[PDB]
């Protein structure tokens, strides 16, 4: 309670500094071309910086959760205000971390590598981001308005109404994902029609390269595996709310069908944090190579693959809880068919970086370590799908290092890949390549010297979501060294934010604008393209420009209040039944009042 | 050429995923209410729920085909759209006075594990198709000072085709819970 | 003129179907819906919309059929 | 410890796998500085690498079904298995007897466990018996476990955190079988019916031998509603900020 008095100072002080600092006069520049702006470039940069807020959101709460596991006995963190700070730490990421890191290098990369002009619905796009944003500040505001909550990103339904007790917590996280939830719908809803109907003349569907395929494989997983994520939070939220039986242990319902339900959503979106980030990686180790992504109808062949046998694996996440053996056998023989489509794409990068050439640039090095420690982490996931051995390191740390290899290495270093690779677009020159190579050093030594032990942690016997270990056969070096290397990897954060302070070798469309940062009707006319890497062919080969006189006029898709004035009636709706209003609403129906007179306003525009 | 008929469709797909969860809920719900009310519903009642939107479709499967497709009946459009208006206050009005006659025995999500499901696989369900009237109402405001022509005013069509999809789950509904 | 006749036969399937009960009940309610939404799909954006909702049907069965499947 | 030799066997598979990828970078690259019919001939090694697991793994999936390490379809001995918040509860239906947050099983003998939970979902992890098993609140689950050598077997919870669900760390031994006899005499408290209701407060808790079965409550393994009628009965229901304590009204027997 002590610690929690400061920060709502320092919140309120950030809110204070917001007014005279920056509100002098911001209805002409803020409220104008941002905030309910229509470009997609636009769009992309507000998805990253709060994906880099909520890494400090999130550092400062990864940072203190190893400072408390430090050692045994250790009474920095007691039993809550960890299981609330471990829970915030888990859902700040992937959620509002990774989505709006992986989105947002979506929705810039993609449009400009495929010729439109902005996106299919460059409306419905708006909103998408305050979707999300809301539903940022929503679970955000639960540090110290009311409470948040302490039963896990997973957050079990046996644990989550009555047996948990406090009212402020599940709500944001069922009220704040179930927003971002339709937000991020609408993302890829928006994506999967613009990289279909919106392509240039001459861009074939085969050849686009392929980066734009990984993206168009996310934007298909959101669709189907979110809806269920809308339904599965609702029918909680109706459990929590509204007075529903659907997981109550009281009323008789079914504990385990709210875990089903999560999961169905679950392991598929977990490939879609890792398929932008597997698309971002094939461009960089194939630009800087300059060679060919040897392998197409064996690579973009092998994208399709986990888009569907994701949906046929969903049940490796159970296991212990005794399913009918025969159903806990195929999806364990399913989850293997999911190693070798993932395996192939490996094969991929190596043979298109030997015979080609290569300068050890800074986005390289982000390349050159994702292939080893995605792959010690994959090299454990085999292993936690051998259902008949998943009973003995189920949770206990060996199942939390395994996955932190998965999507660190995964996402977080292509989020940190395509933060670098594609700065250039975003402002003026780039960052500084030799003090760069500081950043990238440290935070990839500490990185290992975290969760490796942790395999020896989980292996040797400390189980996950503890405290305390106790003196264990002398097994308290190995935790130290963890948060020594948790520590070790917080130097750098510091670092990475340094770099900013200061304020190439390209194959396709990336350099290939008029200059750096493009303009907003982005290309002046629409490549010819006919053939799978643009930019190579349209350097050396020929030069082809953007000739004058043979322009033409503008889009016109200008800019509307409503997306934020929709969204604002979500976080209002959606904070109105979280923070206490049990039963029902006063609040909560009113925002439901105000985003349904919007849609009326959404059919009632001309424009 | 307008794409939001592909986009809003591709969002007819994700509630196939929608029902589906809801429908896994209930399949799994099913053998419940251990400590309750055993389910017993009117079954006159379902036929005439299920052939009130059987003839709704009835009425526009046609009700653009025969319209703006096949010669122009422009006139029509207050004629074929307002009729089928109606038919969606049926459902509506025959399923809340379902829900208040539910309040004998079996009311709401409180009584019993498995009338949370049905109140809820048949409540975004009922939602569903009523936000839709106010979307086909939504677009009979245009002949006023718009009065578009077809191929143009896809309102209509994005509109009409969203309420078409309410009718597959409500047949998959008739055979899912009855 | 032409879909009268399949709004026509649509109705004999719910008739049919309240005699099933007043596999072999589970198809005939995709059945129902085949001949409702082939009058409006293809072609120009077609095989890409029907294409969209084919898979969300394959989840269904995964989803229903997976989770009754425990 | 029976899937025990799959973690080491399987250990050098990917140890191997690891370094395949170190003469894949580490020999060329440097080499390398300014300063078709592969990849489908490649389609035949990894699923040798997944199909000699994807036989072994449901040769064991299987096999945890029936009677596993122990003898053959002799010595049945059930043990229900039920988890209450943070504290663990073990009844004996042969003799009535029943003992909390500890369990003394004889070595070299089936044990049929029937494994359930009272509030929250839990796990008999056990790290020296080796697969656990989810307390599912609503049925019971059999699992059936051995020991291995004489000594002491470290045990935890699956630990769905909650508050106080680290420290659930109940310790289990593994002796003889003239000793087990003797113990098991020597006992017969009894059940004393409103000290079960004592039970369902998580707080921390010592010994509590109980020499008679508590089964003949509502079998605990079916009607999981017994967290109504157990914290409430007695008048609390946590928070999260200020007045708890357990909301007022004493009665128990907690640590000190
Ligand atoms: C995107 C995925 C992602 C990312 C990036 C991280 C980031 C980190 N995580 Fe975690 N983690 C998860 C995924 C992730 N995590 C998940 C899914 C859970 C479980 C969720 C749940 O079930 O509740 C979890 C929880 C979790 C656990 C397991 C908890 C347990 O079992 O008891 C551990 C183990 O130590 C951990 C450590 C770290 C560390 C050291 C980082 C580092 O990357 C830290 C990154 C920090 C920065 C980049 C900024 C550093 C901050 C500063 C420099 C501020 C210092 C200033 C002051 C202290 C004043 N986090
Ligand atoms: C980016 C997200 C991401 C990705 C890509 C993966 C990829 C994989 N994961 Fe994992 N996983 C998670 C995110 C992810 N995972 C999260 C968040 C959890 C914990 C959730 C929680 O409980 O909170 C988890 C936990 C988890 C579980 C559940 C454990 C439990 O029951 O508690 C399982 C079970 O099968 C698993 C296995 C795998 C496998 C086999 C792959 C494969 O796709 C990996 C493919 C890679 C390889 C197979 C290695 C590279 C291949 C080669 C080098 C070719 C040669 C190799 C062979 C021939 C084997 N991981
Ligand atoms: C920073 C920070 C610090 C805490 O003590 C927290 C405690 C609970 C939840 C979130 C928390 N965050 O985010
Ligand atoms: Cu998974």
């Known amino acids: 309670p002590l610690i929690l008095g400061a920060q709502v100072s320092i919140a309120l002080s950030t809110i204070a500094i917001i007014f005279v600092l920056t509100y002098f006069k911001k209805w002409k520049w803020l409220w104008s071309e941002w905030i309910t702006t229509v470009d997609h470039k636009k769009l992309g940069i507000m998805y990253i910086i709060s994906a880099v807020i909520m890494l400090f959101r999130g550092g400062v709460d990864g940072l203190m959760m190893r400072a408390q596991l ?195 959503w679950g392991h598929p979106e977990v490939y879609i944090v890792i398929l932008p980030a597997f698309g971002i990686f094939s461009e960089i180790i194939s630009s800087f190579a300059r060679k060919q992504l040897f392998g197409y109808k064996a690579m973009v062949g092998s994208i399709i693959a986990i888009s569907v046998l994701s949906f046929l694996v969903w049940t490796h996440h159970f296991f212990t809880m005794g399913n009918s053996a025969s159903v806990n056998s195929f999806f364990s023989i399913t989850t293997m068919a999911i190693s070798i489509p993932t395996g192939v794409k490996i094969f991929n990068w190596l043979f298109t970086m030997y015979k080609g050439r290569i300068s050890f640039t800074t986005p390289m090095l982000w390349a050159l370590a994702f292939i080893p420690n995605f792959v010690i982490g994959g090299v454990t996931g085999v292993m936690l799908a051998m259902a008949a051995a998943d009973y003995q390191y189920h949770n206990t740390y060996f199942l939390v290092s395994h996955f932190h290899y998965v999507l660190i290495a995964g996402t977080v270093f292509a989020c940190f890949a395509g933060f670098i690779f594609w700065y250039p677009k975003m402002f003026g020159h780039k960052l500084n390549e030799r003090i760069g190579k500081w950043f990238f050093w440290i935070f990839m030594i500490g990185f290992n010297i975290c969760f490796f032990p942790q395999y020896f942690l989980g292996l040797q016997g400390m189980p996950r979501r503890i405290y305390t270990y106790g003196p264990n056969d002398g097994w308290t070096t190995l935790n130290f060294i963890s948060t020594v290397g948790a520590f070790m990897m917080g130097v750098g954060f510091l670092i990475l934010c340094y770099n900013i302070y200061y304020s190439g070798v390209g194959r396709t469309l990336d350099w290939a604008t008029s200059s750096a940062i493009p303009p907003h009707y982005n290309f002046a006319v629409l490549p010819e393209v006919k053939s799978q890497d643009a930019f190579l062919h349209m350097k050396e080969e020929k030069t082809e420009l953007y000739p004058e006189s043979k322009f033409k006029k503008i889009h016109m898709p200008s800019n509307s209040g409503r997306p934020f004035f929709m969204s604002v009636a979500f976080g209002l709706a959606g904070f109105g039944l979280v923070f206490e209003w049990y039963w029902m609403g006063v609040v909560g129906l009113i925002g439901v009042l105000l985003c349904m007179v919007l849609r009326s306003f959404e059919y009632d525009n001309g424009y | 050429g307008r794409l939001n008929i592909l986009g809003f469709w591709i969002f007819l797909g994700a509630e196939i995923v929608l029902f589906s969860t809801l429908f896994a809920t209930f399949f799994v719900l099913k053998n419940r209410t251990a400590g309750g009310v055993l389910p017993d519903e009117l079954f006159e009642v379902n036929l005439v729920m299920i052939m009130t939107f059987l003839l709704l479709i009835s009425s526009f499967t046609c009700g653009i085909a025969v319209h703006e497709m096949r010669r122009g009946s422009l006139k029509g459009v207050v004629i074929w759209t307002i009729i089928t208006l109606l038919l969606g206050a049926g459902f509506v009005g025959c399923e809340i006075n379902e829900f208040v006659h539910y309040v004998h025995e079996g009311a709401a999500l409180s009584t019993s594990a498995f009338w949370s499901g049905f109140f809820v696989l048949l409540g975004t369900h009922g939602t569903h198709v009523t936000i839709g009237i106010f979307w086909i109402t939504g677009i009979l405001i245009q002949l006023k000072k718009r009065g578009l022509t077809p191929q143009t005013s896809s309102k209509i069509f994005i509109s009409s085709l969203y309420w078409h999809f309410l009718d597959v789950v409500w047949i998959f509904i008739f055979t899912g819970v009855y | 003129x032409x879909x009268x006749x399949x709004x026509x036969x649509x109705x004999x399937x719910x008739x049919x179907x309240x005699x099933x009960x007043x596999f072999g009940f589970a198809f005939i309610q995709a059945a129902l819906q085949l001949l409702m939404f082939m009058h409006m799909t293809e072609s120009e954006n077609g095989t890409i919309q029907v294409g969209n909702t084919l898979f969300g049907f394959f989840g269904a069965i995964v989803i229903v059929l997976g989770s009754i499947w425990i | 410890q029976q899937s025990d030799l799959i973690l080491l066997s399987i250990g050098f598979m990917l140890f191997i796998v690891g370094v395949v990828f170190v003469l894949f970078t580490i020999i060329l690259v440097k080499y390398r500085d300014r300063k078709t019919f592969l990849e489908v001939v490649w389609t035949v090694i990894p699923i040798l690498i997944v199909i000699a697991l994807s036989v072994p793994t449901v040769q064991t999936i299987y096999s945890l079904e029936k009677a596993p390490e122990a003898t053959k379809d002799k010595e049945p001995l059930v043990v229900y298995a039920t988890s209450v918040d943070w504290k663990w509860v073990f009844s004996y239906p042969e003799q009535d007897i029943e003992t909390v947050n500890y369990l003394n099983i004889p070595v070299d003998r089936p044990i049929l466990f029937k494994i359930s939970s009272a509030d929250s979902m839990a796990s008999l992890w056990i790290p020296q018996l080796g697969g656990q098993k989810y307390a599912m609140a609503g049925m019971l689950m059999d699992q059936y476990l051995q020991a291995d050598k004489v000594g002491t077997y470290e045990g935890r919870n699956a630990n769905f955190t909650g508050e106080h669900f680290a420290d659930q760390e109940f310790d289990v031994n593994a002796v003889t079988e003239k000793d087990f006899n003797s113990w098991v005499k020597k006992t017969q408290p009894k059940l004393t019916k409103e000290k079960y209701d004592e039970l369902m407060l998580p707080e921390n808790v010592d010994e509590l031998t109980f020499s008679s079965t508590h089964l003949k409550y509502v079998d605990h393994g079916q009607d999981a509603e017994y967290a109504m009628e157990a914290r409430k009965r007695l008048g609390y229901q946590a928070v999260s900020p200020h007045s708890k304590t357990d909301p007022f009204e004493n009665v128990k027997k907690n640590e000190f």
């Open chain 1, 70 to 264: 430090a050692l045994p006995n250790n009474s920095f963190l007691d039993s809550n205000h960890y299981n609330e700070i471990f829970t915030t730490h888990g859902t700040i990421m992937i959620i509002f971390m990774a989505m709006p890191f992986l989105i947002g290098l979506i929705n810039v990369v993609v449009p400009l590598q495929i010729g439109a002009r902005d996106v299919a619905f460059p409306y419905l796009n708006n909103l998408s981001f305050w979707t999300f944003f809301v539903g940022a500040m929503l679970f955000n505001i639960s540090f110290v308005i009311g409470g948040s909550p302490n039963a896990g990103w997973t957050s079990y339904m046996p644990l989550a109404s009555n047996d948990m007790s406090p009212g402020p917590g599940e709500n944001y996280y069922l009220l704040g994902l179930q927003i971002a939830g339709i937000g991020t719908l609408m993302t890829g809803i928006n994506f999967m029609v613009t990289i279909l109907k919106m392509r240039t003349k001459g861009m074939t569907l085969m050849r686009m390269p392929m980066f734009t395929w990984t993206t168009l494989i996310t934007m298909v997983i959101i669709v189907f595996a979110f809806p269920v994520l809308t339904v599965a939070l609702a029918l909680l939220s109706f459990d929590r709310l509204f007075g529903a039986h659907f997981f109550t242990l009281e009323a008789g319902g079914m504990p385990m069908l709210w875990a089903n339900l999560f999961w169905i």
